[PDB]
Design a protein around this motif. Sequence first.
Motif, mmCIF file in Angstrom:
data_model
loop_
_atom_site.group_PDB
_atom_site.id
_atom_site.type_symbol
_atom_site.label_atom_id
_atom_site.label_comp_id
_atom_site.label_asym_id
_atom_site.label_seq_id
_atom_site.Cartn_x
_atom_site.Cartn_y
_atom_site.Cartn_z
ATOM 1 N N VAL A 160 13.598 -29.831 -19.158
ATOM 2 C CA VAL A 160 12.474 -28.930 -19.402
ATOM 3 C C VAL A 160 11.486 -28.967 -18.238
ATOM 4 O O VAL A 160 11.066 -27.918 -17.732
ATOM 5 C CB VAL A 160 11.793 -29.279 -20.736
ATOM 6 C CG1 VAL A 160 10.512 -28.509 -20.892
ATOM 7 C CG2 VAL A 160 12.706 -28.941 -21.883
ATOM 8 N N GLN A 161 11.128 -30.172 -17.773
ATOM 9 C CA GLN A 161 10.138 -30.280 -16.704
ATOM 10 C C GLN A 161 10.681 -29.747 -15.382
ATOM 11 O O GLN A 161 9.960 -29.064 -14.639
ATOM 12 C CB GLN A 161 9.672 -31.729 -16.565
ATOM 13 C CG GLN A 161 8.588 -31.934 -15.528
ATOM 14 C CD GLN A 161 8.035 -33.339 -15.532
ATOM 15 O OE1 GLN A 161 8.446 -34.175 -16.332
ATOM 16 N NE2 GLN A 161 7.099 -33.610 -14.632
ATOM 17 N N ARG A 192 14.955 -18.211 -19.167
ATOM 18 C CA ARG A 192 14.981 -19.474 -19.908
ATOM 19 C C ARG A 192 13.608 -20.126 -19.960
ATOM 20 O O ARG A 192 13.115 -20.462 -21.039
ATOM 21 C CB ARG A 192 15.968 -20.450 -19.273
ATOM 22 C CG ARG A 192 17.428 -20.162 -19.461
ATOM 23 C CD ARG A 192 18.217 -21.156 -18.631
ATOM 24 N NE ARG A 192 19.647 -20.890 -18.643
ATOM 25 C CZ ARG A 192 20.489 -21.431 -19.511
ATOM 26 N NH1 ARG A 192 20.034 -22.274 -20.423
ATOM 27 N NH2 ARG A 192 21.781 -21.142 -19.459
ATOM 28 N N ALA A 193 12.962 -20.294 -18.809
ATOM 29 C CA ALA A 193 11.694 -20.999 -18.788
ATOM 30 C C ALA A 193 10.541 -20.171 -19.324
ATOM 31 O O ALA A 193 9.578 -20.748 -19.835
ATOM 32 C CB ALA A 193 11.384 -21.464 -17.377
ATOM 33 N N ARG A 194 10.619 -18.840 -19.254
ATOM 34 C CA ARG A 194 9.641 -18.015 -19.949
ATOM 35 C C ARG A 194 9.781 -18.171 -21.456
ATOM 36 O O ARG A 194 8.775 -18.268 -22.174
ATOM 37 C CB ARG A 194 9.818 -16.560 -19.523
ATOM 38 C CG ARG A 194 8.788 -15.596 -20.056
ATOM 39 C CD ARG A 194 9.057 -14.203 -19.517
ATOM 40 N NE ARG A 194 8.123 -13.219 -20.049
ATOM 41 C CZ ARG A 194 6.953 -12.928 -19.494
ATOM 42 N NH1 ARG A 194 6.574 -13.546 -18.386
ATOM 43 N NH2 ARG A 194 6.163 -12.017 -20.044
ATOM 44 N N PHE A 227 15.029 -27.640 -27.886
ATOM 45 C CA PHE A 227 15.030 -27.508 -26.435
ATOM 46 C C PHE A 227 16.411 -27.747 -25.840
ATOM 47 O O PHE A 227 16.733 -27.166 -24.800
ATOM 48 C CB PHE A 227 14.009 -28.443 -25.802
ATOM 49 C CG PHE A 227 12.595 -27.989 -25.963
ATOM 50 C CD1 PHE A 227 12.105 -26.953 -25.192
ATOM 51 C CD2 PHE A 227 11.745 -28.615 -26.852
ATOM 52 C CE1 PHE A 227 10.802 -26.531 -25.328
ATOM 53 C CE2 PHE A 227 10.439 -28.197 -26.989
ATOM 54 C CZ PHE A 227 9.970 -27.159 -26.226
ATOM 55 N N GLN A 228 17.257 -28.544 -26.496
ATOM 56 C CA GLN A 228 18.614 -28.733 -26.003
ATOM 57 C C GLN A 228 19.434 -27.461 -26.170
ATOM 58 O O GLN A 228 20.170 -27.066 -25.258
ATOM 59 C CB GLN A 228 19.251 -29.923 -26.724
ATOM 60 C CG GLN A 228 20.528 -30.487 -26.111
ATOM 61 C CD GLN A 228 21.781 -29.761 -26.549
ATOM 62 O OE1 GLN A 228 22.602 -29.359 -25.724
ATOM 63 N NE2 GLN A 228 21.937 -29.591 -27.858
ATOM 64 N N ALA A 232 20.791 -25.216 -23.079
ATOM 65 C CA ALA A 232 22.239 -25.086 -23.010
ATOM 66 C C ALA A 232 22.710 -23.641 -22.935
ATOM 67 O O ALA A 232 23.921 -23.408 -22.919
ATOM 68 C CB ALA A 232 22.885 -25.770 -24.216
ATOM 69 N N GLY A 233 21.799 -22.673 -22.894
ATOM 70 C CA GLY A 233 22.180 -21.278 -22.832
ATOM 71 C C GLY A 233 22.696 -20.708 -24.128
ATOM 72 O O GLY A 233 23.277 -19.618 -24.122
#
Lengths: 261, 272, 132
Positions: A160-161, A192-194, A227-228, A232-233
Motif C-alpha cells: 500500500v505504501q 489502483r491507488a486512487r 487491501f490484499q 491483487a487486482g
Amino acid sequence: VALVYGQMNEPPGARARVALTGLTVAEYFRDQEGQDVLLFIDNIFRFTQAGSEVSALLGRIPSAVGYQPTLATDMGTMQERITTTKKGSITSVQAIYVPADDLTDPAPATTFAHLDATTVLSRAIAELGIYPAVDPLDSTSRIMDPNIVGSEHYDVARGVQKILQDYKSLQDIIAILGMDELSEEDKLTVSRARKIQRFLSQPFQVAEVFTGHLGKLVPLKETIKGFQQILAGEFDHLPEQAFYMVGPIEEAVAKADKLAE
Amino acid sequence: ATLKDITRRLKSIKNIQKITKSMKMVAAAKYARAERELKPARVYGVGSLALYEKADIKTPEDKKKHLIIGVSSDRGLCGAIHSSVAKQMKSEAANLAAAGKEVKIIGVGDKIRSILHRTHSDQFLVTFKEVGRRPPTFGDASVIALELLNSGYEFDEGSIIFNRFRSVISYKTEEKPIFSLDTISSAESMSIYDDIDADVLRNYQEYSLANIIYYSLKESTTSEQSARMTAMDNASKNASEMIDKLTLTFNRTRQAVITKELIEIISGAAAL
Amino acid sequence: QMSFTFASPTQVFFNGANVRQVDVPTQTGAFGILAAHVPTLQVLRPGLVVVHAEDGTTSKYFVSSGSVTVNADSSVQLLAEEAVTLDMLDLGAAKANLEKAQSELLGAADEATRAEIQIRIEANEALVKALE
C-alpha cells in the motif's frame, strides 16, 4: 471517558500535574480491572512548557533552548508510567505541538524519544475528500515490522505504501503531462491507488448522528483481506467511487452493485 | 553563521525554488505546444531527407566553399544543448580546417555567437536573433533563406548542425548533409531523372534550403523546451535540498542564539 | 507503387498512403501523375492539387508554392507551403486584392517591384480562377 481539564488560566504548577492526574485515573483502570485504557493527552508541549515554567519559578538555572534541566526526567516519569503491564494496557494517544516547525527542539526531542506511531492528520487528503487526512506516508510507526505484526500484514502495508508513493510520483508526471498516461502500468497503478485512497476513508459512528453514513468498525483481518484483494487486482473492474466511505470490502462490492443503476 | 544571514539566504533560495518551478511549468507548456507542432514538421523533413536518400548523390571533393548552419536557441537556461552544438560545430570546423578553406558560417540565436566570440570569431558570417521566443514558423525560415541567398554567398558543401529532438529526457546533436550547388545535384542521379533543367533545379534547391531550415528550427525548439524542462526540474530539486539543509542549520543556529542569550542573562543574575 | 506524402508546415495529408492519381499542379505546367511515372523534381505555382486515392475520389485544393519529387520507386513527396482547402477561401478579398495588384502594377517602376506585383497579381488571378 473521564475528563481531566487543566486549563491555561491556572499556574504551571497546576498544569504540569494534569498528565499526572489523568494518568492516575487511567492507572486505576489498569491496576484494578486489568483493562485496555487510553490516555489522550491534548498537548505534550504544554506539559513540557508547564514543567519548564515550574522549574523556572523554582529558581533552577534553565537548560538549553529555554527549557528545564529536568525535561527528560519528567517525561521519563510520566511516559514510563504509561507503559503496559502484565495486567492492563494503558495507551497514550497524545496531541503534540512542535515549535518553529522544528524537530531538533528539546521538547519534541524527548517526545519523539518516547513516541511509537506519530499518525499525521492534515488537510491535503481532507480536501481530497477523505476524512480526516491521516497521512500514512509521514506516519512512521515503530511496530510496523513483520517480526511483530506478521508477514501478511507487513507485506500488505509495504504494498500500500509503495503503491501510494508511486502514485504520488506518477501524479506529478500526469499533472505535468509528459507522457500523458505514461503506460498501461501507469494507468493501472493510478486506478489502483486512487481506489485505495478512496478506500482509506471510513464512515465514523460519531458522525452518524448528523450524517446518515452509518459508522462501521472494521477489524484487522478485514482490512488485510480488503487491501490484499485490492492490490491483487481482483477488484479492478469496480469504479473508484465504490470505495469512498465504506467500512469493509464486501460492502464496497455491494456499493459497486448499488451504484450500477 | 549569524541568524539574519541564514534568514536572507533562505529567503533567496525559496524564491529561486519557486521561480524555477515556474520556469519548469512554462517549459512544460511550451514543450506541449512544440510537441503537438512537431508532428507535421517531422513528416515534412523526413520526406525531404527520404528524397535525398533515394537520390543518394555523393559529395564532390577538392573544393572550398563550405557552410555550417548552427541552429539552437537564443536564450539559454536549458542544459547542455549549446555545449554539444558548439562542440560539434568546432569539430566540423577543425575537420574542415584541413583540405577545406571557406568555413564561413551562419548561426542563429545569441548563444551560438556567444559561444563563438573566441575560437572562430572571424569566420561567423551571419547571426540571427529572437529564436526560441516565439515558436518557429516558416516565414522566419524564409527570412533565414533570404539572408543566406540574397545576401550573396555561394557554397558547395557543409552541414546544418541542428538540435535533434528524440525524447522527453534525451536529445541528439548531429548534422544533415546540405547539398548545395546544382553540380552536386545534377551529376548522375538527376541525369537518370527527368525535367532537371538548371533554373527549376536551383529553385528546387533554394526551397530545399527553406525546407531543411524549417525542420531544423522546429526540431531545435522542441529539444530546447524538453531539455529546459529537465534542467528546471533538476534545479528545483537541488534548490529544495539546499533549502532543507539551510533550514536545519538555521534552526540549530537559532537554538544556539537562544541558549547563548539565556546563559548570559543567567550568569548576570547569578553573579549579581 | 506510389506513396503520395503531401505535407505543409501546418499539416500533413496522406503521408504513406496508396493513391491512384495526383494532378500535380505546377509552374512548368500542371500535369497528372499515376503510379508508374518518370522521376522528377519540380517547383510549384499558385496552383491546384487534385488528389484521387484509389476509388475515384476527387479532392481538389489550393497550394501557394512548394516542391514535388518522385523517384523510381514511386514515393511522391509533395511538400507544399500553404495548402488551403475550398472550405477555407473567400471571394471578395481576392477580387479587391487583384484590383490593388492591378493598381500597384500600373504604379510600379522597378524591375524587382514589378516582378513582385506580377507574381502577386498572377497568384490572385489563378486564385480567382480556382475560386469560380
